[PDB]
Amino acid sequence: TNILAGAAVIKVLEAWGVDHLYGIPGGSINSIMDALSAERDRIHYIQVRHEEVGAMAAAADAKLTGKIGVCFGSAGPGGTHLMNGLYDAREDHVPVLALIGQFGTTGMNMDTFQEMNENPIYADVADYNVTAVNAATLPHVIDEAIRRAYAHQGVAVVQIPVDLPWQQIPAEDWYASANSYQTPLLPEPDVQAVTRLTQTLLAAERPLIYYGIGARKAGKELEQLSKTLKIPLMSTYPAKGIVADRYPAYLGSANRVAQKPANEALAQADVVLFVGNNYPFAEVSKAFKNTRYFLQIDIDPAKLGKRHKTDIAVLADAQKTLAAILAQVSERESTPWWQANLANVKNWRAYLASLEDKQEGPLQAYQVLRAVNKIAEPDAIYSIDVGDINLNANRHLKLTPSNRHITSNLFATMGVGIPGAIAAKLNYPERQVFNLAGDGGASMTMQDLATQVQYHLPVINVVFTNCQYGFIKDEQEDTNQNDFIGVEFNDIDFSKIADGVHMQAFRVNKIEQLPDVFEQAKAIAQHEPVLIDAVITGDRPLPAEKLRLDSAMSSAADIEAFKQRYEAQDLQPLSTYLKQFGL
Amino acid sequence: TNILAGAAVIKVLEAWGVDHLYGIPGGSINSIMDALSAERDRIHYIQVRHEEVGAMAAAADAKLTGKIGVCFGSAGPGGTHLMNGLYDAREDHVPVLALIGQFGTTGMNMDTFQEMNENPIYADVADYNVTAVNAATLPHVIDEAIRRAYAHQGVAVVQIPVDLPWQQIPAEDWYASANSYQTPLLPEPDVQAVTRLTQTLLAAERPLIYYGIGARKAGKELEQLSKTLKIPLMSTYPAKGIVADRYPAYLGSANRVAQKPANEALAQADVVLFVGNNYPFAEVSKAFKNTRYFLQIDIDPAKLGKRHKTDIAVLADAQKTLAAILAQVSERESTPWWQANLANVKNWRAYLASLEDKQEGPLQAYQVLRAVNKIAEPDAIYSIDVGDINLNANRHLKLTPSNRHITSNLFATMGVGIPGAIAAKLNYPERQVFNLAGDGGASMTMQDLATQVQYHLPVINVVFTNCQYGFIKDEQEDTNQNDFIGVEFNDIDFSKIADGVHMQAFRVNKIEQLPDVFEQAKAIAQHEPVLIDAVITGDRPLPAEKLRLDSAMSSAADIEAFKQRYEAQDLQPLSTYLKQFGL
Amino acid sequence: TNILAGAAVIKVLEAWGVDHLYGIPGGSINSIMDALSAERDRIHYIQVRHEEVGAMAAAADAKLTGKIGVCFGSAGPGGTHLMNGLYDAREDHVPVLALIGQFGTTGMNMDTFQEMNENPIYADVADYNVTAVNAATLPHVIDEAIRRAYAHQGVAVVQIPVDLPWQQIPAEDWYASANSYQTPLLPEPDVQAVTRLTQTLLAAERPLIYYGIGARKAGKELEQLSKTLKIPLMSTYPAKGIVADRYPAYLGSANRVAQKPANEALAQADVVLFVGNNYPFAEVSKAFKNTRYFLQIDIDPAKLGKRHKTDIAVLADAQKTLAAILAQVSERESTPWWQANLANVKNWRAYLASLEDKQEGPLQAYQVLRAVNKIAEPDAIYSIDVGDINLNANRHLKLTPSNRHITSNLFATMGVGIPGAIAAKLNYPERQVFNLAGDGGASMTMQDLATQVQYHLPVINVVFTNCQYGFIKDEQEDTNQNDFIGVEFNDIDFSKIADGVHMQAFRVNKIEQLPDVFEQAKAIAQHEPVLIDAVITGDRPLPAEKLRLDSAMSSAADIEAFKQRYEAQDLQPLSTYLKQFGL
Ligand SMILES: Cc1cc2nc3c(=O)[nH]c(=O)nc-3n(C[C@H](O)[C@H](O)[C@H](O)COP(=O)(O)OP(=O)(O)OC[C@H]3O[C@@H](n4cnc5c(N)ncnc54)[C@H](O)[C@@H]3O)c2cc1C
Ligand SMILES: Cc1cc2nc3c(=O)[nH]c(=O)nc-3n(C[C@H](O)[C@H](O)[C@H](O)COP(=O)(O)OP(=O)(O)OC[C@H]3O[C@@H](n4cnc5c(N)ncnc54)[C@H](O)[C@@H]3O)c2cc1C
Ligand SMILES: Cc1cc2nc3c(=O)[nH]c(=O)nc-3n(C[C@H](O)[C@H](O)[C@H](O)COP(=O)(O)OP(=O)(O)OC[C@H]3O[C@@H](n4cnc5c(N)ncnc54)[C@H](O)[C@@H]3O)c2cc1C
Ligand SMILES: CC1=C(CCOP(=O)(O)OP(=O)(O)O)S/C(=C(\C)O)N1Cc1cnc(C)nc1N
Ligand SMILES: CC1=C(CCOP(=O)(O)OP(=O)(O)O)S/C(=C(\C)O)N1Cc1cnc(C)nc1N
Ligand SMILES: CC1=C(CCOP(=O)(O)OP(=O)(O)O)S/C(=C(\C)O)N1Cc1cnc(C)nc1N
Ligand SMILES: [Mg+2]
Ligand SMILES: [Mg+2]
Ligand SMILES: [Mg+2]
Secondary structure (H helix, E strand, C coil): CCEEEEHHHHHHHCCCCCCEEECCCCCCHHHHHHHHHHHCCCCCEEECCCCHHHHHHHHHHHHHHCCCEEEEEEECHHCCCCCCHHHHHHCCCCCCEEEECCCCCCCCCCCCCCCCHHHHHHHHCCCCCEEEECCCCCHHHHHHHHHHHHHHEEEEEEECCCCCCEEEECCCCCCCCHHHCCCCCCCCCCHHHHHHHHHHHHHHCCEEEECCHHHCHHHHHHHHHHHEEEEEEEEHHHHCCCCCCCCCCCCCCCCCCCCCCHHHHHHHHCCCEECCCCCCCCCCCCCCCCCCCEEEEEEEEHCHHHHHHHHEECCCCHHHHHHHHCCCHHHHHHCCCHHHHHHHHCCCCCCCCHHCCCCECCCCCCHHHHHHHHHHHCCCCEEEEHHHHHHHHHHHHCCCCEEECCCCCCCCCCCCHHHHHHHHHHHCCCEEEEEEEEEEHHCCCCHHHHHHHHHCCEEEEEEEEECCCCCHHHHHHHHCCCEEEEEEECCCCCHHHHHHHCCCCEECCHHHHHHHHHHHHHHHHHCCEEEEEEECCCCCCCCCCHHHCCCCCHHHHHHHHHHHCCCCCCCHHHHHHHHHHHC | CCEHHHHHHHHHHCCCCEEEEEEEHHHHHHHHHHHHHCCCCCCEEEEEHHHHHHHHHHHHHHHHHHHCCEEEEEHHHHCCCCCHHHHHHHHCCCCCCCCCECCCCCCCCCCCCCCCCCCHHHHHCCCCEEEEECCCHHHHHHHHHHHHHHHHCCEEEEEEECCCHHHHHECCCCCCCCHHHCCCCCCCCCCCHHHHHHHHHHHHHCHHHEHHHHHHHHHHHHHHHHHHHCCEEEEEHHHHCCCCCCCEEEEECCCCCHHHHHHHHHCCCEEEEEECCCCCCCCCCCCCCCCCEEEEEEECCHHHHHHHEEEEEEEECCCHHHHHHCCCCCCCCCHHHHHHHHHHHHHHHHHHHHHHCCCCCCCHHHHHHHHHHHHCCCCEEEEEEECCCHHHHHHHHCCCCCEEEEECCCCCCCCCCCHHHHHHHCCCCCCCEEEEEEECCCCCEEHHHHHHHHCCCCEEEEECCCEEEHHHHHHHHHHHCCCCCCCCCCCHHHHHHHHHCCEEEEECCCCCHHHHHHHHHHHHCCCCCEEEECCCCCCCCCCHHHHHCCCCCCCCHHHHHHHHHHCCCCCHHHHHHHHCCCC | CCEEEEHHHHHHHHHHCCCCEEEEHHHHHHHHHHHHHHHCCEEEEEEECHHHHHHHHHHHHHHCCCEEEEEECCCCCHHHHHHHHHHHHHCCCCEEEEEEEEECCCCCCCCCCCCCCCCCHHCCCEEEEEEEECCCCCCHHHHHHHHHHHCCCCEEEEEECCCCCHHHHEECCCCHHHHHHHCCCCCCCCCCHHHHHHHHHHCCCCCEEEEEEEHHHHHHHHHHHHHHHCCEEEEHHHCCCCCCCCCEEEECCCCCCCCCHHHHHHHCCEEEEEEEECCCCCCCCCCCCCEEEEEEECHHHHCCCCCCCEEEECCCCHHHHHHHHHHHHHHHHHHHHHHHHHHHHHHHHHHHHHHCCCCEEEEHHHHHHHHHHHHHHCCEEEEEEHHHHHCCCHHCCCCCCEEECCCCCCCCCCHHHHHHHHHHHHHHCCCCCCEEHHHHHHHHHHHHHHHHHHHHCEEEEEEEEECEEEEEEEEHHCCCCCCCCCCCCCCCCCHHHHHHCCCCCEEEEEHHHHHHHHHHHHHHCCCCCEEEEECCCCCCCCCCCCCCCCCCCCCHHHHHHHHHHHHCCCCCCCHHHHHCCCC
């Protein structure tokens, strides 16, 4: 007995637990479509309006769940539209399978309609990149692609000539290897190495623990190490929320999508424990230029000593290692360094609250995010686009271990807010989901607001309309000789865009309008998507990478100007607190 | 004395006559931005809302004018968004320069933010693909890119580390080679070869001349050869309009974006003169399977004998060769073959008019295109998206040599309607410009309706809203076993989308609504863009590749069903006319 | 009724006039081998000992005859061994077809033995690069590859799964387009532009005509223009021989594989006519820094203004353009510039003769090449390897239009001497063929001396054994601060290598041994290959790019050291001759 090869391919996807996949049909992929059509009860096809949104959503599925995301594109332009999401998956090292339509084998290499050698298109993005040429082996090739995407934490691409999935193959020969999949059991971190790292950390005068998302399983240990040892915590931006933002010794992140206390403390630290962290600004920003000892914990040999000359680098799991450190230490009394950092954080959080707490007047991003906080459930998921929203969300969202947030961390493709939210709601239909996006990024993927409507995905979309590429405008202010260019543009009314795709929506431009609009949105999103278009000022957010508050470091005139522009009259530099506690 | 390298790069663009260019800024391209900002009087930067639209518009500039189109994208995701337009330019063999942002040379290869080796990304699409590494040679590298894009009729990509354009270079050293550019003077076609081709063509019983856009300069000669010799004309779809559609012996195009008379005549012809033609369906459709002699005229040696075994292939310019044929022939009396084809065309055009001429009821694509015809100026330009609109526009638009029409001919990327119209209006601000697009394709690039508003580009946008990927639905009807999938979707109200980007718009769903809406649109578009969202039926357009009208070829039941579905009761098969005139 | 697809492929090669092709069999290409075996009376397979030699020989075939060269390699390592020859073909812009074995379609993408995705391997080198997936279209794919390689003057690569050539296909369907082949049209010169060019050339005070191999059809015109107008000639190294070396106003080539008079004159010229020339050193050596007017003639628009800004650029065939110049000028009287250059050439040639004319003592390269000249037929063909031999052969070989010489002009891969001579003897069995090679380059392809023996190809191989990479040693002398490294090595006795492959051979180390050995070799090579291993001194050949003879430019100490090292006591700088004639 026989099975169509395409039917077998869909059963391989099912065997691996793929719940949903994204794409747009075409003749060159209609035989995979045909197989999907027969399997609607067991795999859920999501028709997007642009294939980039399918690729981005597949990446987001894997970011959220750790399960492979799946997308497809038709021959030629369908597949090339996947690129921004495939590069996101590559750079954020998450498993994605991409299927690319191709002309049948009888027409390949004939220079027929929309027929090209597609393999070179995907060679750079993909861990695995093959054109299938046989029906009987096609299930194996898909299985191989999936297994490699997982093993190698990246993108597998298969170009499929459209004739193959309509061929009959023997029913009993194909298989999936999902049944073999497992995660490794690791040795203990060695006691001796943990031990010497630990002594160096404890001997420090001005220690910091600086973690990334490799420490995602270690939030409890991080906070308890911090509290017991009196060592402040800082993180990469993506690692926000691993430790609750409310934790009083959480300094935030460094560089620009950053918080003041983290930058200031890092400049003063003598020892940094760098754990589960691949911070891409380390070298270019000279982050560690005056660090005395640099200690690392990472699971990947490729990372050991990568970002700075490392005194001790432990190849181990972050949680297991941090637990092993915790088990060999005990209480230290409060130190001046601890107290100075606590005071600095309190001052900073008072500044952010002063921005949030305005009650009337021209709307700024700060109050919009306060309004999000006010309607957010404790386990909400945030899909965040790319721009000033990363900076502002990093400062204002009040996250805990129960939340998730995703963006395009390293490729930093705009437009990911909408697709990430689609994926979040598909995976977690009982959890509240936000899409927080600037106007520039929302406009790139705006058509796929219709996908939220079509699939009844109750995302709360919040568009930050400044009529700018604000993140880039501020860069031009900093570097460009000549006038601003390409960074200020006409308005788009996203409430009207929403209406056009048949989504309920609101537009607001005044602080006092927020509470009732956000309460209405919270309620609508019990059952249907909603959009809030927040018309915000062009105020530049405080640049944590260009602080002008320390009279030993900056002129009085520069400090006065900084305080004025950034509403920062009550911020004190870290040195004030260092001095207060005798450092 | 010195000049900034970026300033020199902009002067190279100016030297080559580049009027306008497209892109979105980013830090990684802010030094090119800076140079553009100082040169606003002499080069016009168009800020798009998605970089794919900039790439597509650059391709369209070159399709329209023959001048190189220019676009750019920021590092990583800005550049990868260009792909669908770059592949369009490659496949439609038009010159485009693409500039890609990159991290400064001091941070390249550090694994910093959004920093990657960008060169492999563009290797497949590009004729020329380099990463610049020196400021003093950067003007030369841009000059080289332009010169190669022209010479090789394709895409040149330059990745530019952002530090280089801010470096000073000696003022007197750089140059542009635009001053050297010229077009070749060719020899005559040889008299002997033209002569033997001509005899074979004239000896035929059932000749056809089948031209593509390589014959774009030869419309006069084509029509006069046809009339003098009594030889019907057929074309590739893109070659519509080279000879006026009204010409009574213009049969149309073959395959699917096709007209009935062309398919039918081609099946019967004994000799085809294939001129300036690279029809991609030739082999797969067995177009020439019963052609006795196949004659070719083409400028490119790579094309000689490519699509079919060729009896005589003349390497020459199409116009010069067709003129040389015309100069050696004279009047032939009407033949039965001529008369049969004339009769067949009249019957077909009566069918199309019957569809157009309905006055009331549910709106179909056919009447929308009649309404376009009624408001179109004689020299209007049409940017056409990808889908059923190619099929329907091919049949219904009444073009002459004074018109232009463009689509993505071979890559066939959806979304090109909007960008092509932007480019058309930028090049030809005094000419009427239409964007004719299906709902699927319009939705992919809908955000760049805002670019038409921002730049006050008075495009007439007509969206054909069937709530389907209709072209693909019909494919699934033809090939798929299982139910339709991914081809029927929710409505988007493009009048509301238009309102959201601050464009005047209308939505219509009834035939009787068309005249006043189209008259209003015609008037608005004297000064501002406008959009008409035409809600059309799901009726399948007649498939010229699956005709069921000939009782020697098809069952009576199949013919009855075809006539019913396609409103084709009064169409006669070509064989009726052949018989009438004694063949 | 049916034909094997492999048989049809070989028939395509035969239709295109392929006489011989090179490679090494493997399982992965045994079905093409089987088809070759059946066709061995009409197409001739040459089994090489290393696939690189097959690729190099294929490139040399095309360099010599203009006929596409054909090579193949087995899957994986057979094909990757082709690379140095394929890149040679790309860079020297000659047509080559390369066939690459691949696993059968049932085993592709299974990760079986020596099975990989081969398409990305060839993407950079190839103009056309496809994996065949169907037997019936395989003849067309090969035809396409050939037609493109010719039209685009580069490499076409086809990966062939081994099952396809053993499949039956319909006998009637396949064809070759060889019948339709034509070479590109030759554009014609604009008559105004040529008149303006001529005027500028004639108004020059210190003109030069500087041609490359694009002027290979124009030697008569070049020499006559030089004589009529009293304008010296210089060329690219590859263009040596287009005008006979004995012509008294031939200055030679510039840069390093160069002759003194050319460098010196170019530095003083006010007007250069740059014809059929893509000299790669133009910019980096600042060749044209002081040139007032630059006049260019080239067929390729990609070249116009490439190497320097043009004052007049003519997109036309070199011989037609030079003929048109010649036709509008008449005899001009001698000038001071003309006489100064003639005197400089005489002085230079007397130097070279002095080196050649030694009759006893330690053997130098110079006398070896004199001995070559003494046994060389007037229509001899020289295959030249890469290193000091290019420099020395350029100075000493006495070539005329009746000769050919080839090397790897631009990629400059060592090892080409032996394959180029194989190809030359295959294409020109009645012409004398030399392989002139350094010991380093001969070593790299030494095993294919056996191929000359096996096919009874009577090449005269001359190996220049200095026990050095001499060309590179001299570079280290010029740039490196530390001691020589990697450039002096142990001896290989190539007369023993030749004995090992069963080739007659001689080793010489003294000038007085040359005449008898070379006469013996001349006679042996009436019927069989022969090798002369010339043990030469480590003397550095005079560096034409670092002249130290002009006491206005150089210290007496540096002049005296140069004269002593290079036996150049009788050389005078061009300024001596300029001054004699009042310049
Ligand atoms: C517009 C924008 C601007 C940005 N700018 C900033 C900025 O100013 N500041 C900032 O902080 N970020 C910024 N980012 C994000 C930044 O680009 C990097 O993605 C981020 O800093 C790196 O975070 P990470 O190290 O947590 O994650 P990753 O780069 O994913 O690294 C995770 C590390 O954990 C290790 N690992 C994984 N699992 C384990 C385990 N079980 N045990 C141990 N180790 C493990 C990995 O091997 C790896 O080294 C920005 C993002 C955007 C969108
Ligand atoms: C959705 C969609 C469906 C389509 N399906 C169809 C269809 O059913 N039917 C159809 O006809 N098209 C169809 N097309 C277009 C099709 O893909 C090809 O692009 C088109 O048929 C080729 O047209 P062409 O030969 O005129 O142009 P090109 O492919 O650009 O070829 C031009 C030829 O002219 C030669 N040339 C150039 N200049 C000269 C000169 N001066 N003198 C002589 N020769 C010269 C070139 O060398 C080349 O061979 C479709 C397009 C779309 C978007
Ligand atoms: C070890 C080594 C060192 C070398 N160093 C030197 C050196 O010091 N000096 C030196 O001179 N060379 C040197 N070379 C060779 C050098 O690398 C270049 O290959 C050579 O200078 C370029 O020669 P060309 O312009 O004649 O050929 P090409 O680069 O092949 O250019 C031919 C030109 O002719 C044009 N053309 C073709 N047909 C026509 C036509 N019908 N009419 C008009 N134009 C036409 C083409 O478009 C092209 O621009 C060296 C080679 C080796 C192996
Ligand atoms: C234009 C832009 C950005 C502007 C985003 O504008 P938004 O309007 O979305 O956000 P805001 O800052 O105004 O709130 S940020 C980004 C950097 C971080 O890479 N770039 C460059 C960029 C350009 N194009 C794409 C597709 N993705 C990108 N990341
Ligand atoms: C989905 C689709 C098409 C549907 C277009 O839907 P539209 O709604 O735009 O048009 P209509 O037919 O309903 O009037 S046509 C096309 C073929 C010709 O390639 N494809 C495949 C396709 C898929 N994705 C992109 C970006 N471009 C493509 N060409
Ligand atoms: C090693 C070397 C050269 C040394 C050649 O040594 P030879 O011993 O052959 O010649 P000679 O100079 O001693 O007479 S020249 C060359 C340059 C021109 O590229 N290179 C670099 C080189 C290195 N490797 C290969 C395969 N090809 C090359 N061209
Ligand atoms: Mg914005
Ligand atoms: Mg549609
Ligand atoms: Mg040597």
